[PDB]
Amino acid sequence: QSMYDRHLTIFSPDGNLYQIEYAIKAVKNTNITSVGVKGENCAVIISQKKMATKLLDYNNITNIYNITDEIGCSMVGMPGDCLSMVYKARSEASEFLYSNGYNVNAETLCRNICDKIQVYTQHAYMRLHACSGMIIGIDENNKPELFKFDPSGFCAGYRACVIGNKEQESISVLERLLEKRKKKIQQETIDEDIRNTTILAIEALQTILAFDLKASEIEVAIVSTKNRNFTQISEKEIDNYLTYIA
Amino acid sequence: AGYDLSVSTFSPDGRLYQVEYIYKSINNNNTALCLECKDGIICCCINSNMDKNKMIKKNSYNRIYHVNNNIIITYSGFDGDARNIIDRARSEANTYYYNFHTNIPLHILVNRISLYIHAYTLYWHMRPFAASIIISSFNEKDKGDIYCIEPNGACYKYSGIVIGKNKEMFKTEIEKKDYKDINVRDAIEDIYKFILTSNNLQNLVNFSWICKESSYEFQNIHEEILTPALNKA
Amino acid sequence: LTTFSPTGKLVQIEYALNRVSSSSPALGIRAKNGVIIATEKKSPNELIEENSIFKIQQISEHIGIVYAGMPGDFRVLLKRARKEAIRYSLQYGSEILVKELVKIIASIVQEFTQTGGVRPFGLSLLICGVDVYGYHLYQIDPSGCYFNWMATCVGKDYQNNMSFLEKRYNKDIEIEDAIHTAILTLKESYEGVLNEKNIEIGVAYDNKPFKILTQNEIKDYLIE
Amino acid sequence: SRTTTFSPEGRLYQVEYALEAINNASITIGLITKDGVILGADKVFISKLIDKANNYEKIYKIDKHIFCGVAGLNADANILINQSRLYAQRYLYNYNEVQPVSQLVVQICDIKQSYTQYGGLRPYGVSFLIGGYDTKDGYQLYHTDPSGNYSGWFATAIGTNNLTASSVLKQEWKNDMTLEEGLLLALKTLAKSTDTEIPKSEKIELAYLTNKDGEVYQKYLTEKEIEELIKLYTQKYIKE
Amino acid sequence: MYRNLYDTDNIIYSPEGRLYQVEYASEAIKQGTCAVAIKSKDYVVVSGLKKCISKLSFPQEKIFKIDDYIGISMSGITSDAKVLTKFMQNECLSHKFLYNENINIESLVRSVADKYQKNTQKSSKRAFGVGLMIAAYHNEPCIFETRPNGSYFEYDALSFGARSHASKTYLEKNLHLFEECSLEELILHCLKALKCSLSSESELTISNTALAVVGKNHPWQEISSLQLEEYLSKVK
Amino acid sequence: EYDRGVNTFSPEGRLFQVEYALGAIKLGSTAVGICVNDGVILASERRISSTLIEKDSVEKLLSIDDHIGCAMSGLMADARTLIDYARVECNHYKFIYNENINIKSCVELISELALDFSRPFGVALLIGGVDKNGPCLWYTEPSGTNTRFSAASIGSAQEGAELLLQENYKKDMTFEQAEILALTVLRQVMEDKLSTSNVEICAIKKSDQTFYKYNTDDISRIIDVLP
Amino acid sequence: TLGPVVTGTSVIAIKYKHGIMIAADRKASYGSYAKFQNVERIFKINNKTVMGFSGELADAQYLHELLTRKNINNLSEKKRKEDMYTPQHYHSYVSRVFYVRKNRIDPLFNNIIIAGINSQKYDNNDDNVLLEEYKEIHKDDLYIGFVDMHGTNFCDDYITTGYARYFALTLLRDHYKDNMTEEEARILINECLRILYFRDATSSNFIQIVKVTSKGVEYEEPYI
Amino acid sequence: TVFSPDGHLLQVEHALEAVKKGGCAVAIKSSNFAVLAVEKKNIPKLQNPKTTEKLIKLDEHNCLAFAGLNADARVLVNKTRLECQRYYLNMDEPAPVDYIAKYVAKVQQKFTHRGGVRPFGIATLIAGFKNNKEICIYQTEPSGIYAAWKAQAIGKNAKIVQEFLEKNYQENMEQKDCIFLALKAIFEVVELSSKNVEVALLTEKDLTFIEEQEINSMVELIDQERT
């Protein structure tokens, strides 16, 4: 029947915003996943490089967008809504420099994005932005930071999180992968986090996607200390890390 | 239960209806085509609207537009709504030329045009655009690149792409010959052979190529090179 | 455009009250030397770091707030709450009074009901703090009204959760004694029996600045 | 539909539901005496965990000589009080004198009337007994509705059970009423409206103006009304 | 669920992919009177048929004037056609004031077709249901026309809704107008289109068919009320 | 049934909100105006059924200016708004250009105000004058169609007066010729007698180029000729 | 702006049978001294028309960019060779830019000279924006216009702006002939700018001569 | 506010019917004065002056007795008293009754033509003075129409009281005779209570009320006239 989900600013009898609820299903319907995990003095984002459901140049299609030279982020969901969200973030992070001098913090960037998102929720101005992403980046405290935001307002932040269509089949796997490094050996920190976290990150993606995970269909980025650049790891290093599973 | 009315209404399945109908709107209009070559980027545009007018001029209905001397733009869909995007494209070049005194690059124009089309989708009162845009260029050092902008953003780099009423037909004809390293002067004769497969011997297909080492700038159709069409092989 | 109804009651407000009736339980109890607040932090997993997601935020050096509804709305009302704690602090050099602050946030929530094309706030607030006129613990309703409570709960199943406070509360209770009667109103009230550093508790801490109790600090009280 | 549309009967819809929405709210009593106007209230008790000693949300203060007893939506009541306090002060800033209540209700009913006429917004589900003292015509007691049709009175009992409590003032009220006799008069109608015989004193609140050439405008404490409640026991100014 | 949901709004699209509100405007121009224009090598003649609503009434004007070398002929509703005339008049006159050269024809219609576009995406303003017919001459006489959706077609002959099909067929087999350089044969060829496409048993041209010519040494000269019935409205 | 929007079209190519007002103009008082070679003569009824009225405050033939007079029909409360607007722009024209405005330039602006896209003005007029090029008579509609008429009629009884003028209008008719003709069509469609109070004719002569309301005394000498 | 801080010298525009001859030095003086000695002033605005400066060089970019932009917009709608913006259009447009600035107080001190070919009888229906024999013109298809900072505009057969108006124009008003040869025009300017080397305090060598013929816009650089 | 499929206005006819459920008010013109009349009701032993619910002033010479929505008159009068004084500031003359009535009618008309605005559900009647020493009682409806009258009545069952006034309306009357005619209009409120009828005698450009003392001397004579 004609239920109460027509507009976006109208509550339901039980009290649920169904326009927001349907917008989260838009991200789960794009069948594009991504994993983000923060370890010691580093954090990485693993993309998937797939068309949001011939002759397409695969180097152009991606799900990683640097907001600044220090704060990078990923995007999923509808390709139209995710592109405009980066521009509503690049024009915001750069605005922080012109209005406050310092570079924007990773935790302040996500909370400032959610403030604009919440405004479009209470008002019937525009449609919701069917997207999600993992904002990555280190701060002035020399600590890595990761933050995930849903189509609604959220500044959760996780040490390891999965965004995409498989969030209901990955917490049972990421908890074990995180446990495979925290309560395990944990010897020292020889600044070899890439061989310690990213190796224990790509392994998490292989446990989610049952494919062989071709190196020409995956691209990661690191924002660790001594680098501080959100550099996209080259193809040769990606294929080299894929053979480390043996 | 009728949820595809406005553009701000999300379907319960998760899809975004009222914007997917636009793909069914561009699938009934005339087609456009473009492809990469080792000497330039030859374009194409078939206007399959011969059975009703037959009174228009031969070289009047042109659907090839350029923002400046080195970036071409075509339409596929509502010809009226595409005029508004060209106005936003040329103004984007002119605004970029004032603030930076140089030609606007391709990877920064496509990202600004796709934002303009996507911006009208979010509104509850403005209707979305109904025109798919093909943006291409050909650098002197680097090779060409064709960006395809469909409704609801999604800027994608291509190497050959067709959009219109036979997108599932001409796509199979391009993957046969590797057009990445052939020429422009021979591909133009091959393009006219494809149109004859899928519907008469008429000169209603106007198209230009951006580069034939002709100062690497957007030329015209050059009728003398178009008239020796291999109409049989 | 949240119009009236023939029965004489707002229907969108009644629907908004159902959202706060199905969220995490928030609980505040005043005392004679401070006010305490508590919230059952439903930890979904170990990925969410506790120092990021919170339910107890500050407004000034003497005002504490608690959320009880739509988590996405836990920041917009906070931004205008801190902004009002600054606009009053610019003109008037002293601290912002709780009654002067709660009447402004109640006016902000009110304007999101009468305005056309807007949605009411899906949360219930719990403003508490030290004042020059004693202590206070107010509760803001999505309708816009506010109550000068003494000990109340606003989360899920509060019809029976308040029953613990109607029979296990005295007018003269110290802040240290009120902690165990608040934990009992959380652990012994419903599910969430594995209360091991999964409860955020803020206190007025006998006229000192607002203190957010740490996990190991609450562990001293969690043994009973 | 919306408030902009009329009805075939000639009445409205949004302003008609608001007139009924205040009928499900607590009662308030108005009363003009020969010493000063007095007001009544009914604190609705959601639970026994309210402060019940420092505050009460049924009688507010507009100015140092104008005060109203609200009845209706407690949420929407705070806006008009925040709107009437400005008009009671903008008149002082523009004319250097106190504002007469006759020029205040007109300034406040127009803000209600402006909502039931355009904007497409819901009306104000509020109605209150606003009274005060003035040098032009002494003590006064006005009464507004959600439509704006204000009217002067001597005694009014809006809220819940109006027709029963208003009938009490049709006979027991007198033209000459002292301050103490008026309080006992308004105390019975405040108690019998809730179908009770005696107020629990952890209930109803009263206020009174009684200008002693300075407009004292004292409110009441939970201990001060005990003496008034005790006087009702001996001298019962019964239902009738 | 179809046939009545995607019909009254200028925003919604049909599931097939057709903006049915704008498509009604294209058909709304067919209820108007007929019109026809002939593009010769150096001249352009426009034949417009007025419509006498009553015997006491006067035939309302159909062919208008914009500039010396630019004149349009509406076909549709007089409400929106008059608005586009003022927009086209203030635009071309501003070009002769801001600069000194005349306004380019295709650069003018691009502004007029854009006016249709601005009244198509907004939900409040509807589309101009009027079929314009811009006939002009700058360096080569060209004839342009619009529709409710933004369009331009450098036509060589046209028709407009009354008996367009009977008139389009006459122009399809008459493509010798380009060599009919003599203006007298052109106006007789253009008037023959209406004579062979008028209604059944109606009055042919009893001084109620507006005619206008434009060319090399010809401004938008409206054909006088005497030059047409002497020999042009007397050959047939 | 499409009636929600104001600017909706029809599958047959027609408007809807405008067509509703097309029938609203067929309920006002009848009127008739004749454009002769020497001037323009107007006529109307005066529904002053209740004798308590002042009989002069209610008028059907107002004046746009001293050279242009007009009639009214339909919503009398909305007809005054267009006449007040016409009294501004025609007078504003005299301040810019020293000559009087042309009716062709005045009726085109009185019709553009009925193109508010509020609601369309449900009113039809019979604007007439002797501005330049002799006298002209125009008849506007809420749809915006401005058709110059030689002799037309608007009102609840405009159907009967239409065919009467077709069988009576002659091009070589003077003022006194049409003055009796402007009353014989009113004598047919009338639920009363053509007294000296129900008729309110006025004319604009070509000589003085100004309008002059025919008072109660002058109309008595014209209503008694018995056509 | 205010005050000609970075002025320029004067240019000389003379028309003849093969085309338009223009000349200008490269000295950009900073008031009292030669700061820049290698700047360009003869600006190419189309494939058939050019424009020169004088006055403040800084207030020329606000006019050069506002003019070269219009050329690309016109080039993007080139559906015929006759749709190119004739010099009559550019000169009348530049005068409108100066007239709207004259209504305000800021005038953008410049004395722009616009020259070009006002015809379309020489095939150039192909534009090479980013980089045999001549012809004879009827002297009426060659447009050379002047624009003052006050908005004064006209067109003639020989224009000279800035400080050379009192020196170049005098020698050129009586020595100018009709249908001058190419060697006659360059020898006329060479003997003319020599006078502007011993009298003008702000002038130098590097006469950037630019000729606009029926085949393109050339460039040359003598040194006298 | 939009039209109807036949030609009426559902937002105006509803508002025009809304004034029918209101207190009656009758006015009557005379030679050099114009006495007004209104019939209200109040709860006994409460509501002492009814805050002068009717017979509102606008100037020194312009009375106004509305009818209908009591709360919607404040916005109508305040938007009128402001215009009555603004006219005095720009033309240096006390606003004539012809201008006030032409303004009140334009206020109600400006509310039905615009969209998203509820029409003024109030029908009034203004009695004042013109520029010359004259008195013309006007009467405005919520639709926007207005016309002068020699006597008029609006409110609950205004037809039966206006019909009675149409018969025994003399031309020129006496100050007490004109009051008796207005006091013979108690055909709306049964038993003719003196605490219900309120009359004011607007004379010599100075409004004044009528005390209840002389009311009883005139309201009691009507009972001894039906036999």
UniProtKB/TrEMBL annotation, chain A:
Q: Which UniProt keywords apply?
A: Cytoplasm, Hydrolase, Nucleus, Proteasome
InterPro entries assigned: Ntn_hydrolases_N, Proteasome_alpha, Proteasome_alpha-type, Proteasome_asu_N, Proteasome_sua/b, Proteasome_subunit_alpha6
- The EC number on file is 3.4.25.1
Listed GO molecular functions?
endopeptidase activity
Instruction: Extract one GO cellular component term from the record.
Output: nucleus
The principal location of this protein is: cytoplasm
Could you say which enzyme class this protein belongs to?
Answer: hydrolase
Q: Which domain of life is it from?
A: Eukaryota
Gene3D superfamilies assigned to the protein according to its UniProt record, in alphabetical order: Glutamine Phosphoribosylpyrophosphate, subunit 1, domain 1
Keyword NADP listed? The answer is no
Kindly list the cysteine pairs connected by disulfide bridges.
110-155
Protein name per UniProt: Proteasome subunit alpha type-6, putative
Which locations, inside or outside the cell, does it occupy?
Answer: Cytoplasm; Nucleus
Biological process GO annotation list?
A: proteasome-mediated ubiquitin-dependent protein catabolic process; ubiquitin-dependent protein catabolic process
Q: Indicate the segments forming the Proteasome alpha-type subunits domain, all copies.
A: 4-26
Question: What family does this belong to?
Answer: Belongs to the peptidase T1A family.
From TrEMBL, chain E:
Q: Which family does it belong to?
A: Belongs to the peptidase T1A family.
Q: Which domain of life is it from?
A: Eukaryota
Query: Proteasome alpha-type subunits domain location, by residue?
Result: 6-28
Write out the GO MF terms. Answer: endopeptidase activity
- What is the organism of origin for this protein? Plasmodium falciparum (isolate 3D7)
Note the SMART domains from the entry. Answer: Proteasome_A_N (SM00948)
> Cellular location of this protein?
Cytoplasm; Nucleus
> Matching Pfam families, A to Z?
Proteasome, Proteasome_A_N
Ribonucleoprotein as a keyword of this entry, yes or no, is no
The protein's name in its UniProt record: Proteasome subunit alpha type-1, putative
List cellular component terms (GO).
cytoplasm; nucleus; proteasome core complex; proteasome core complex, alpha-subunit complex
Q: What is its EC number?
A: 3.4.25.1
User: Taking the first listed entry, what is the main subcellular location of this protein, grouped into a coarse class?
Assistant: cytoplasm
TrEMBL record, chain G:
Question: Where located?
Answer: Cytoplasm; Nucleus
Q: Which residues form a coiled coil?
A: none
> Record's Gene Ontology CC terms?
cytosol; nucleus; proteasome core complex, beta-subunit complex
Q: Which PROSITE patterns match?
A: PROTEASOME_BETA_1, PROTEASOME_BETA_2
One GO molecular function term?
Answer: hydrolase activity
Q: What is its main location?
A: cytoplasm
**Can you say what this protein is called?**
Proteasome subunit beta
Q: What is the lineage of its organism?
A: Eukaryota, Sar, Alveolata, Apicomplexa, Aconoidasida
From TrEMBL, chain H:
Q: What is its main location?
A: cytoplasm
* GO CC entries: cytoplasm; nucleus; proteasome core complex; proteasome core complex, alpha-subunit complex
Q: Which InterPro entries match?
A: Ntn_hydrolases_N, Proteasome_alpha, Proteasome_alpha-type, Proteasome_asu_N, Proteasome_sua/b
One GO term of the biological process aspect: proteasome-mediated ubiquitin-dependent protein catabolic process
Occurrences of domain Proteasome alpha-type subunits (ranges): 1-18
Keyword Aminoacyl-tRNA synthetase listed: no
> Record's SMART domains?
Proteasome_A_N
CDD domains per record: proteasome_alpha_type_7
- Subcellular location, record wording: Cytoplasm; Nucleus
- Any idea which UniProt keywords this protein has? Cytoplasm, Hydrolase, Nucleus, Proteasome
A single MF term (Gene Ontology): endopeptidase activity
Subunit and partners: The 26S proteasome consists of a 20S proteasome core and two 19S regulatory subunits.
Q: Which PANTHER family match?
A: PROTEASOME SUBUNIT ALPHA/BETA (PTHR11599)
Per the record, the similarity remark reads: Belongs to the peptidase T1A family.
Indicate what this protein is called per its UniProt record.
Proteasome subunit alpha type
Q: Which organism is it from?
A: Plasmodium falciparum (isolate 3D7)
